[PDB]
Design an enzyme around this catalytic site. Structure first.
Site, PDB file in Angstrom:
ATOM      1  N   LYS A   1       8.658  48.959  20.653  1.00  0.00           N
ATOM      2  CA  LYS A   1       8.138  50.166  20.010  1.00  0.00           C
ATOM      3  C   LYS A   1       8.549  51.421  20.760  1.00  0.00           C
ATOM      4  CE  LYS A   1       5.874  47.882  16.836  1.00  0.00           C
ATOM      5  NZ  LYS A   1       4.586  47.280  17.272  1.00  0.00           N
TER       6      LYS A   1
ATOM      7  N   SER B   1       6.136  51.617  25.988  1.00  0.00           N
ATOM      8  CA  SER B   1       5.239  50.822  26.830  1.00  0.00           C
ATOM      9  C   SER B   1       5.947  49.521  27.199  1.00  0.00           C
ATOM     10  CB  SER B   1       3.940  50.505  26.073  1.00  0.00           C
ATOM     11  OG  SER B   1       3.065  49.696  26.845  1.00  0.00           O
TER      12      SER B   1
ATOM     13  N   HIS C   1       6.881  62.775  -2.958  1.00  0.00           N
ATOM     14  CA  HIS C   1       5.486  62.412  -2.773  1.00  0.00           C
ATOM     15  C   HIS C   1       5.422  61.228  -1.810  1.00  0.00           C
ATOM     16  CE1 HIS C   1       4.915  64.837  -6.377  1.00  0.00           C
ATOM     17  NE2 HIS C   1       5.838  64.099  -6.966  1.00  0.00           N
TER      18      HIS C   1
END
Lengths: 449, 450, 450, 448
Positions: B271, B265, B144
Site C-alpha cells: 500500500k 508502512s 459523477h
C-alpha cells in the site's frame, strides 16, 4: 425522484435569459447535423423555421412557459416539438446537456461582457473628461487620511480612471478565453458523429474551438476569471466610493452628490446621505462572495462532469446584473456631483508646504538632511513667533540658512507646489494633461477591443 | 513608540529576501539623481560602490541585521551609511518608502513569476509528452464518479495540460502588468525633482512606467491578480490530485505513485499513501486564503497610501514559495507514477457500449430516440438471458431492429469505441495527436513570451 | 524521499511552540501505559524523568534541534531515546501521530484562548471605564457618515464594548469544545490497548473526552470556529478603527492618538497618522484569510485522516499571535487617546434638532405625520429667512402651528435632546449608566467563567 | 431619484417573506404605544384589527403589492392606511426602519432556526438509528483513501452524527443571541418616547432586550454567526457526501442510493449517479460564499447605520432555504440507501491485520519496535511463500518469534480486530453502543 431534489434541480425560475443563446446554439448544431447527414435538407429548413419562431416569441415577450418546464432547455425543446413534431427530437443527436449548457453560458457571458465593457469605458471616460475640465482645481492629497500634500483634483480622479482601465484590460483578456466554442464536446469523450466543429464555430461566431472535450465539459475557469475580474473591479469602486463618501461629509465639505444619487429628509434637507456610494461599496462583498463560492465548488472535484457545476449560473447572473447596475450608478454619480472649489482650496494650509521649503533648498545644493533640518527650524520659528511659515520674513529664514533668497516666496503658493511634479505620472498640469491623453488613447484601443 | 506596536511594524523578520532588488532599485535611483544634478559623479561612484558591498554582504550571507532594523530598507541604508558615511543620506532625496517598496515587490515578483513560468511549462510538457507515449492506453471516462464511456488515458492527461496552459496564459498577462515601473511616484503626488523615469525604467529593465503616482503608490492589483492566477492554478492542481488519489486506491487499481512521492508502512508494503497529492490539494486552500485576505485588506480603503497595504508581502512570499514547490512536486509525480494498463483495460465493460450501439443505428438512419430505445431493449434482453450485450445474437438483435446487420459486431470493441471521436477535441487517436501538436506549439509560443 | 517533498512536510520551523504541550501529552500517556502494564512502574519513572529534562531544555532555550528533526514531535522523540535509550520507544505503543497532534493543538489553543480572553476583557473594561468617566461628553451620532442626532460620547464607546462582549461569549463557547480530550483515539479506530482515557483526561486537565475516534482524528471544527470567532472580533475592531481614524482627521478634529500609537513627521508636528488603527484594520483581512483557507482545506475531504489537515497549525498560530498583539494595541489606543470635548460639542448643530421639534409636537398630542410636516415647514421657513431653526421667533413658529408654545425653547438644547432617550439602551444618562452596570456584571460573569 | 438607483434600493422583490413578522412587530409596538399614551384604546383596537387583516391577506397570498412599494415595511404601512385611515400613521411614532428591520430579521431567523434544528436533529437521529441496526457490519477504515484498519460501519456513521451534534450545539448558541429584542432602539440613539421595551420583549417572546441602541441597529453579528454555523455544517455534509459518493462507485461497491436520490440511464440500468450527494457537496460553496460576502460587507464600515447593511437579507434567505432542503435530502439519502454487506465484507483482507499481529506480540510483553519488526518479518515471509499472512504455519511464525502460540490464530478474525477498541470512543461493539446512548442523551437535551 424526490420532490425536494426536483426543486433543487429546477432553474427555469432564473435561466430563461438563456433563451436566445440556447436557440442560436440549436440552429448551428442543426445545420451541422444536416452536413453530417443526420438531418435531410427538408428537416433542417423545418427545424430552423421553428427555432426562429421560438426566438421571435421570446423577443416579442409572448413565449409561454409551462409548469412542466424545469429549465430553459426543456422549455425550448417542448416548444419546438409543439411546432414541428417528432422531427424535433433528432436535434439532440450526438449532443449532450453537458456541452450545450456551457455553450449557452459562454455565449451569454460574451454578450454580457460586451455590455459591461461599454458601461465600464463610459465610467472611465466620465472621470477622464471631468479631470480635463476641472484641471485647475487643487485640494489636499491624503495618506492615513491625514493631509499630506497639495494635489490637483484631476490627479485624484485620474488615479481611479487608471485603475479602472486595468479592469477594462482584464475584461478583454477574460472575453478572449470565453470566446472559444465548447459545443461538439459531447457528454465527455467528444462528439461521436464527426460533427463539423468549424461550422459550429463560424455559425455561433466564436474565435476558435476548445482543444479537449473533457476540459471543455468540466472547466469553469471562465466563470472564475470573470468573477475575479468583477471582484477587483468592485474593489476599485469601493475605494472610490469610500473617498467620495468621506469627501461629502459636512466635515470635509469637498463635494455634494446630486439628489438623484442620494437620499435625505425634509427635516434636514441640507444633508444628503450618499446611498449610491454605499450601495456600490456594499456590492464588493456581494460579488466577492460569488467568487468565493465558485472556487470552493470547484476545489477538489474529480474529472469529468459532476452536478456541482450547476452552481455556476446564479453566480454569473448575479454578478453580471450587479456590475451593469453599479457601473451606471457610478457614472451618474461622478458625472453629476458638485465640487466645492472654495472648500477644497481652503483645506490647503501653509503647514503642508514645509516639504516644499526643504525641496527649495535641495534644488540649490543643500543636502537632503540639511534641507530637512532647515525646514524643521523654520516651522519651529513660525511656531515661536505665533505665525505660519508662509509668513516668516526673509530675515527670519536667512537666520536659519543663507541659502534662502527672496525667491523662496514662490514656495508659498499651492500652484507652484503641484507644479513641481512634472516627472511623468506626477500632479503637475502637463503631467495630468499627458495622462488624459494616454487614457483617451487606451480607451480607444480597448473600444476597438 | 509602544513595544507591541513596534513588533507589529517589523517586517525585517520576513522581508530580507528583498535585499537584492532593494539594492538594485537604489542603484538605479542613485544614477538618476546624478543625472538630475543631485549627486556628483564622485558621489555616485562612492554610493554605488557601497551598495555593491552590501549586495555582496547579503550574497555571502555575512550581512549583520541589528535589533534596530525595522525592515530591509532600513537595514540597507543603515549599512550604506556605516560604509560610506554622510553621503549615503542624499540617496533618498525625492524618494519615498511608498514608491521604493512597491518597486522592490514588483521586481521581486517579476523574477519570481519567471521561475514559476519555467516550472509550470515543465509540468505541462511532462503531461503532454507522457500522453504521446501512452497514447494507446484506454480506460473508463467518469461522470459523477461512475463509469461513463471508454476514453484514452492520454485524453485524460491532456485535459489537465490544456487547463494548465490557460493558467500559463494568465501568468503571462499578470506579468505584463507587473512589469511597469512605479519608482519615481514619490510619496503621493509624484517625484518632485524632475527625475528621469525613462532612465529608471531602462536601468531596472521594466517595459513601461506607471501612469499616475497616486495609483502607482496605492494599488495592489498586481498582488491580487497574481493571487487569482495562483488560486485558479491550484484549483486545477487540486482536481488532478483528486483524480490521481482516487485512481491510486486499491479499489480502482489504475496507477501507483513512486516511493519518492508517497509514504507507506512496513506492515502493508503493497500500500502507498499519496502524500504528495494530498499536500498539493491542501495548498489550494492555503493559496485561496491569501487571495481572500488581500481582497479584504484592500476593500473600502481610502486614497492614497495607508499602512494596511503592508499585508501584501507575506501573502506574496507564501504563494510564490507554495507554487514553486507544488509545481515541481506535481511534475515529479506525473513523471514517475506507474500505470497499470492491465487494470485500466480490465475496467472496460460491455455495458459501457450500449451508447455506441445506439449510435450504430443512428448512423444507419434510425432517429435518435428510436435508436436509444432499441439499445435499451437489447440491454434488457441481455439482462433477461443473463448475458452481456456483446453476447446477444444477430438474430436476437434483428428482433429488436432490422437495422442491425452483421457488422454491429464492430460496436463491441473498445478501440473502435474511442475511435468514433474524430471531431476536434475528441478522444480518437488522430484528435489526441492533434492536441499534442497544438499544445507543443502553444508551449513554444508561451516559452517565447519572456 | 524527494527533497522538495521533504521540505513541504517539515514543520519544525514553526511548530516548536508546541514543545511543552507535546511533553505533557507524553507524560500523561506514559502514566496511562504503566496502568495498562505496557511500562513497568520503573520504566515510567525513567520516561517521565527524561521528559522533564527535555521540558527544562526548551524552558531555558537550551534544546538543540537536529538537521534531521522534521517536526517538534520527532525532535522530542529523538531527544528522549537519546536520553533514556531504547526504552523511550515503548512510549508510542498504541499511540499515533494522528491523535497526538490534535491533542497538542487543543492543549495549545486552550492556553492561548485564556490569554486572548484576558486581553479581550481588558479592552472591554477600558472602553467601559472611559464611558463612565466621559459620560457628560456629547457629539454627533452618524449614519451614512452624515450627522444624524446628538448622542453621548459614552453611548458610542459602549456600542463597541457591547459587541466585544459577544465576541468574549463566543470565545467561551469555542473554549468549551476545545476542552475535550482527543488522545486515545489512535490512528483511526481508537486505542487498541484499552487505555484509561479518563486518566488521560484528568492528567491533561480536559473537561471531558472525545466521543468517536474517527471524528476526533479527522475534525478541525475547533480550528474553524476559533477562526470564525477571531474574524468576527476583527470585524468589530476594524469598525472601531475606521471610526477612530475618521474622528482623528483634522476635518472632524474629535480626538488625537498618543505618540506611542501613531506616527508623524517633524515637518508637520501637528499631524498624527493613526498607524495603530490602520494596522488593526488591516488584520481583519489577514485573519479572515486564515478562516477562508481552512474552510477550503476541509471542504470535500473524505474520512478519515488525510495529510491536508496539516495546514491547521500555521493558521492557528498566526491568528493567536495576531489577536494577542491587536487586542493589546487597541486597549492602549482607547486608554491613551485624547478627545476634544470642545470640537465634539461644536459639531452639534441646530439642524440636528428638527426631529426633536417634531417630537415636541407629538408629546402635545399632534399626530406623527402632522408633527413631521410642521417641523419640515419650520425648517423650510428658517432656510428662506436665512436663519437656523433655534432662531425662528415663536411668532414665526406659531404661523406654522399654534401648538408651538414658549416652552419650545427647551427643544433647542443638546443635553435635553440626548435626555429624551431613557428607554433601555438609549443615550440618556440613566440609560448609559444602566449599560455600564450591566457590562460590569457581564465582564465579571465572563472573567469568572474563564 | 435615478431609476437604476431606485431598483437597487428596492428590497420588495425579496423581503416579502418578512411579511408576517413585520406585522407581529407592529402589533407589539402598537400595544406599547397605547401604554405610552401615543394611541388611545380605540385607535389600538382599530390598528390591531387592520394589522390582523393584513396578516390574513399575506397568509392567503391575496396581498396586493403596488409599484410604489419599496419594501415590505412600506407595503404594510400603505395597506394599513388603506384599511383604517389616518390613524394608521400614528403607528410609526418613535420607530425607525432601522430598528424595525433588524427586529423582523431576527424574528424570521428565530423561526427559521427552529425549523433547521428540527431537520438537523432528524438527520442525526437517522444516522444513529441506522448505526444501531447495522452494528455488526465491518468494512475498511480509510486514511489517505487507502485501507488502513477494519472498523464497524456504525463507527463510520457515528463519526458523522457526532460532528453534526456539534453543529446542533452551535445552532443553539446562535439562536440565543438572536433571541434578543432590538425594537425600541430607534434610528440610532434609542426610542425617544420612553417606550416600554420589556412589554415589547414579552409580546414578541424574545428572551431579553438589546443593551445599546447603536450596536442593536448596526451590528449583524447574528447574520455572520448563522452563516458561520451553516458553513461548518455544510463542511460536515460535504465530507459525508464525498464518502458516500466514493463508496457508491462500482469500484468500491459498498452501497447504492435509491432511485429517489440518484439518476441513471436505461442504457446502463445498473449504474446510479449520486446527484443528491453532489448537490449537497456543491452547496457548501454556495453557503460559504454568503459568509464571505457578509464578512466583506461589514469590514471597515463606520458607525452607525449604513445602507451597506441591506445585503444581509438575501444571504440569510438563501442559506435558510439551502440548509432546509439539504438537511432533508441528506436524511432521505441515509435512510433509503442500500449497503452491500457482502462487498464491505470482501473488502476486508489479511494484509489489514499485520498491525494486529504486532499488537498480539505487544500484549505478550514484547517491546513496541521489536513486535513491529517481527510482524514485518511475518509479512515479508508470507510474501515470499506467495501466501497471505493468515496462512503462515505456527512454525513459520515461531521461526520469527517464540512469542507466537497457537492462540495467534484468533488474530486473523475481523470481529476480533474491531473488538480490541473498547477504550472510550473506539470501534468495539460496546463503545459503539455507548456512543449511541450518549448522542441520544445529547439530542434529548438539545431538543429541550
Amino acid at each position: 425522484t424526490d420532490p425536494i431534489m426536483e426543486k433543487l434541480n429546477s432553474s427555469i425560475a432564473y435561466d430563461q435569459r438563456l433563451s436566445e443563446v440556447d436557440i442560436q446554439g440549436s440552429m448551428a448544431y442543426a445545420k451541422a447535423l444536416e452536413k453530417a447527414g443526420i438531418l435531410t435538407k427538408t428537416e433542417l429548413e423545418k427545424i430552423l423555421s421553428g427555432l426562429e419562431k421560438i426566438s421571435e416569441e421570446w423577443s416579442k415577450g409572448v413565449f409561454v412557459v409551462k409548469q412542466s418546464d424545469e429549465d430553459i432547455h426543456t422549455a425550448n425543446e417542448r416548444r419546438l416539438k409543439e411546432l414541428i413534431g417528432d422531427i424535433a427530437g433528432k436535434l439532440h443527436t450526438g449532443r449532450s446537456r453537458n456541452d450545450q449548457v456551457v455553450t449557452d453560458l459562454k455565449l451569454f457571458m460574451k454578450n454580457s461582457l460586451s455590455i459591461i465593457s461599454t458601461h465600464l469605458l463610459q465610467l472611465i471616460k466620465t472621470l477622464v473628461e471631468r479631470a480635463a475640465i476641472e484641471i485647475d482645481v487643487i485640494l489636499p492629497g491624503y495618506s492615513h487620511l491625514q493631509k499630506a500634500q497639495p494635489i490637483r483634483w484631476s490627479q485624484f480622479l485620474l488615479s481611479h480612471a487608471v485603475a479602472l482601465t486595468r479592469d477594462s484590460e482584464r475584461l478583454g483578456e477574460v472575453k478572449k478565453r470565453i470566446n472559444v466554442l465548447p459545443l461538439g464536446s459531447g457528454a465527455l469523450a467528444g462528439n461521436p458523429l464527426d460533427i463539423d466543429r468549424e461550422m459550429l464555430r463560424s455559425e455561433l461566431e466564436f474565435a476558435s474551438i476548445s482543444l479537449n472535450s473533457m476540459d471543455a465539459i468540466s472547466e469553469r475557469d471562465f466563470v472564475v476569471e470573470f468573477l475575479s475580474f468583477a471582484t477587483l473591479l468592485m474593489i476599485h469602486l469601493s475605494k472610490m466610493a469610500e473617498d467620495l463618501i468621506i469627501y461629502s461629509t459636512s466635515e470635509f465639505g469637498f463635494l455634494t452628490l446630486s439628489d438623484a444619487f442620494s437620499t435625505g429628509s425634509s427635516l434636514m434637507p441640507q444633508k444628503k446621505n450618499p446611498d449610491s456610494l454605499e450601495l456600490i461599496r456594499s456590492k464588493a462583498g456581494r460579488v466577492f462572495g460569488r467568487l468565493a463560492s465558485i472556487l470552493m465548488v470547484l476545489k477538489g472535484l474529480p474529472s469529468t462532469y459532476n452536478k456541482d457545476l450547476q452552481e455556476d449560473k446564479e453566480a454569473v447572473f448575479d454578478v453580471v446584473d450587479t456590475l451593469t447596475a453599479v457601473l451606471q450608478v457610478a457614472t451618474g454619480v461622478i458625472s453629476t456631483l458638485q465640487i466645492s472649489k472654495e472648500n477644497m482650496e481652503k483645506a490647503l494650509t501653509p503647514e503642508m508646504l514645509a516639504t516644499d521649503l526643504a525641496l527649495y533648498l535641495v534644488r540649490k545644493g543643500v543636502p537632503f538632511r540639511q534641507a530637512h533640518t532647515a525646514s524643521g527650524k523654520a516651522v519651529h520659528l513660525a511656531e515661536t513667533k505665533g505665525i505660519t511659515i508662509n509668513k516668516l520674513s526673509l530675515e527670519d529664514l536667512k537666520s536659519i540658512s543663507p541659502q534662502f533668497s527672496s525667491d523662496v516666496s514662490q514656495v508659498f503658493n499651492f500652484v507652484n507646489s503641484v507644479e513641481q511634479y512634472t516627472a511623468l505620472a506626477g500632479t503637475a498640469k502637463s503631467s495630468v494633461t499627458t495622462q488624459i491623453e494616454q487614457l483617451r488613447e487606451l480607451m480607444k484601443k480597448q473600444k476597438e477591443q
